[PDB]
Amino acid sequence: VQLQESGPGLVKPSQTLSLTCSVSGGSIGGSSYYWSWIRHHPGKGLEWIGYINYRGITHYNAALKSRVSMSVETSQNHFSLQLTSVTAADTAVYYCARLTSDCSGGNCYQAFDYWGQGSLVSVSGASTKGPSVFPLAPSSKSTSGGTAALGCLVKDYFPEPVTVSWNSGALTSGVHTFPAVLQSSGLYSLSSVVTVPSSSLGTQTYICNVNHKPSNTKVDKRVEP
Amino acid sequence: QVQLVESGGGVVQPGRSLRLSCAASGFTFSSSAMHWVRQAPGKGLEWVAVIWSDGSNENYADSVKGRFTISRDNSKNTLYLQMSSLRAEDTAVYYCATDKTYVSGYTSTWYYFNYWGQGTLVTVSGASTKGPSVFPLAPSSKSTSGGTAALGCLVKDYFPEPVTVSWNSGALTSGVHTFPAVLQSSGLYSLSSVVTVPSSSLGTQTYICNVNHKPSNTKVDKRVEP
Amino acid sequence: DLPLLCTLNKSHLYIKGGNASFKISFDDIAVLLPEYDVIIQHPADMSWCSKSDDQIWLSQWFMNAVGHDWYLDPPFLCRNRTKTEGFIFQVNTSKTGINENYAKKFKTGMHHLYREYPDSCLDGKLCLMKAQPTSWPLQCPL
Amino acid sequence: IQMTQSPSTLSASVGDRVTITCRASQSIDNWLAWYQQKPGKAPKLLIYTASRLESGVPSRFSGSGSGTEFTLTISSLQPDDFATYYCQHRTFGQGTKVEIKRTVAAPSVFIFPPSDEQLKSGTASVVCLLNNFYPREAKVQWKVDNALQSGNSQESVTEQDSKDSTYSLSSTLTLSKADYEKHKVYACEVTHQGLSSPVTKSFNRG
Amino acid sequence: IVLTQSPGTLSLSPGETATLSCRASQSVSSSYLAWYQQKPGQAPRLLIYGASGRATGIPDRFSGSGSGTDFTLTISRLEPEDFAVYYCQQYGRSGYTFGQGTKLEIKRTVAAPSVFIFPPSDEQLKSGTASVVCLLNNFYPREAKVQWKVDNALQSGNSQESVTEQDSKDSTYSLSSTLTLSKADYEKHKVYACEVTHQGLSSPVTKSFNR
Ligand SMILES: *[C@@H]1O[C@H](CO)[C@@H](O[C@@H]2O[C@H](CO)[C@@H](O[C@@H]3O[C@H](CO)[C@@H](O)[C@H](O)[C@@H]3O)[C@H](O)[C@H]2NC(C)=O)[C@H](O)[C@H]1NC(C)=O
Ligand SMILES: *[C@@H]1O[C@H](CO)[C@@H](O)[C@H](O)[C@H]1NC(C)=O
């Protein structure tokens, strides 16, 4: 059983955010099966939004009931989430789950068992920005014995996030993709490194596969000493 | 037409299991839920277990719950109560009761009991079955008035309950007060039955007490004179 | 595909969704109690009341049809699923006390679902809503 | 979810408007019943759901109550109503024994010596009778040369008589032959309301 | 209704048992409470359902317990792959409110950082910007001190630090401070240093480069 989230990365304020979750494994609902949406704020805890049944039965959160609608279609196995008059305080990571309330003895009405990876939703009226990828070339000072280190700096982009693959996703061993940190100028800056030994100095070409889907920029920067 | 009969169970040493049944007739047994009721003489009533009709055995009374079981057989039309790891405090009379629904659109669980049984006295004691020793209560000539004088017998140290006492093989009813059984220190029930007779009946009529203890088969007839 | 409704006599109220069919009755007789039974707060509590899919759905469709505010309106009682006694959900619809505001709201509901219903609930006396799965009546069409 | 019945023992005469109360720990609306147990037979169901009488129970019995407080009133009780009543639900009531109201009766106190056959076995018990008295609260004080409470722990009572509705008590002092041939005067001090000066019936040995 | 999860952060050694408390303001008659495990950069998964029963595919070292207000999650024989954020949930007064959260740090031997320095890229230097990146590879614990030295003078207000969460494969963290300056500022100085202070590396190592 799997779940997939699909919606816009950036939604302008006072507008409508809409995301749709894909049920993989079985048909939508049945006896003791509800489909929810669980929001996740930056630092601030998990908030539950609302659910929908196999034949469309909804119940929402007290603070969200005023502006949240949800839909469902059992024919193609997908359910909706609609929030109107979005604000900056509606910036979170939206996960879709399965509530369920079937058991063996007691505690039948239980909690969410299956979840999706979740889509990051940024709520801002600011224009999107393309990340300028700069290769961090392996230098003589960045050589500590038999090992070396190299990387790529995904500088000045908006909104979050960016996906960094290495050698088109070949080498994952000894890789550290750092989280995005807001700049002095107030833009996202991502670092991503890899530690290859000094033996493989001028052998295999090291390319970072950077992707910024909200701006649709696919940059393949080569790192050479 | 509704009748509820019990199997039987008496003496049992504390800890040993005792099994009891309840045959039912005159009503649709498989429909009405059935269950038992504990009744000690020194407390009155107490509910002990419940079983829904046609399987799905529900809980018991926490008073004793964990150490015994209740069963139901709809083919034989009998009820069951298997009392294991007994304690001395279960010295009681066990009734069989029914009822389900309520005359309107309701069915679901009813701790009410419209039709009862007879009850089988189950004494939980380790004491050995022994015969009673009968002693005559000497009619003293204190209240020597020609209309009032007491006379009796003493059914001392017997086990287990009960004891049936009569006078002149059922020829006396006036003044005959058969006192309840008292289980004295370290087993052995002991009671006494008295009769009020005029002083004229003292030296004319022969008074004997028809005491019997069928659990020990001891039939005693004792001559009472001052 | 909308749940079937039926009106008979006054007291004989009927409903059918899918395979399930209930009997909505109003009287002062009590069968469900708190601590003893279940406390339905939102429609996800109802799913551990029955095993049948139509039996859970019709009960939650009937409560959303009458206008039971799952946030404001008081919770109601239900029978534990693993119980052979059957299926029954009870809504406290007493027209006096704290449930007086809820009872008149529930009174107008039957006046718009079953259209005309002279309420078998006494205004200023104990009254309880009780639904039990019944057979689909002969008189009730479809 | 626990029951509380009061009074302990209702003492009333035939014709009175007698009424019994019942309490509940949890707010129980209509899940209560009343029982009638004449000692020697299983109780009969009187009324169910605190308001509706059972099919075939006299009209004088009336149960009223909802919420937590329940009452069982008998408009004009007949002699065939004198029994112990109980509450229902999971838990049960203590039992409000219903006794008659009678004129106070003095007990006919009678002291009985231990039998000669009883004396030879080693254990000789002294018996004291006090026949047909109405007020149940009657206490017996065993006085052997003026003191005792050992064997006094064994006393029994018959239930209210059918004719004159009076109880009768049998106090049995139990002791050994060793303790018997060690004391002289054996007394049975009876304290009762029907006795202006509590009467003492005594013997010695001969 | 209010859910409070205590403590804030639980740094424990593998094998040693971990106990997490979750107190409710209003007395919860259980069943709605369920524990969660969210591993870094992943979807949370159900640990315990109805506050007692362990979920599907969840080990028995994880044990759900409690009644009333206090509810306790207990993880006995810890491992480095048990590093996650733990949450307790509840439905009360219309809303599935969740817990605060306790980040469980799996301890290990105090490891020294592998410090490497990167000068600004050729493409960046032509664009009138210059970013010096100091990489600090796989150390323990997270608590590390880093500063920039421009011709033996500290530079602040431009340098932004980035830290990854505990790489459960070896229980180590990593850092990247990015000192940003203009083209003119890069030309006016010649030696750029990265001052590193950590418990693992007792001697404060300063790795520098020349223009
Ligand atoms: C269903 O709703 C009704 C109506 O609200 C409930 O009946 C009422 O319950 C309350 C709480 O037990 C009663 O209040 C009590 O009143 C007595 C005095 O009469 C007082 O001593 C108590 O402390 C308490 O305040 C209320 O009186 C009673 N309704 C009336 C008008 O008599 C009912 O309990 C609810 N539940 C069910 C399943 O029936
Ligand atoms: C329902 O049944 C289960 C299993 O026997 C039991 O644990 C629970 O206490 C019952 N009632 C409620 C209110 O959940």
Numbering used by the authors:
A (entry chain O): 2 to 226
B (entry chain B): 1 to 226
C (entry chain P): 87 to 228
D (entry chain A): 2 to 207
E (entry chain N): 2 to 212
From the paper:
The arenavirus surface glycoprotein complex (GPC) is the target of neutralizing antibodies. GPC comprises three functional subunits: the stable signal peptide (SSP), GP1, and GP2.9 GP1 binds cellular receptor(s), and GP2 contains a transmembrane domain (TM) and mediates membrane fusion. We determined X-ray crystal structures of JUNV GP1 with the weakly cross-reactive antibody Fab and of MACV GP1 with the potently cross-neutralizing antibody Fab.
For the JUNV complex in particular, crystals grew as thin, poorly diffracting plates, and intensities for higher resolution reflections were weak. A limitation of our study is that the structures we report are of low resolution (4.0 Å and 3.9 Å for the JUNV and MACV complexes, respectively), so our ability to specify the details of intermolecular interactions (e.g., polar side-chain contacts) may be limited. CDR H3 makes most of the GP1 contacts and engages the receptor-binding groove formed by GP1 loops 3 and 7. This form of the glycoprotein should contain trimers of GP1:GP2 heterodimers, the TM segments, and SSP. CR1-10’s ability to bind cell surface expressed JUNV GPC, however, suggests that its epitope can at least be transiently exposed. A partially “open” trimer as a conformational state is therefore probably accessible on JUNV GPC. It may be even more available on Candid #1 GPC, as mutations it contains are thought to destabilize the metastable conformation of the glycoprotein. Although the assays are not directly comparable, the discordance in apparent affinity is consistent with a model in which CR1-10’s lack of neutralizing activity may be due to poor epitope accessibility.
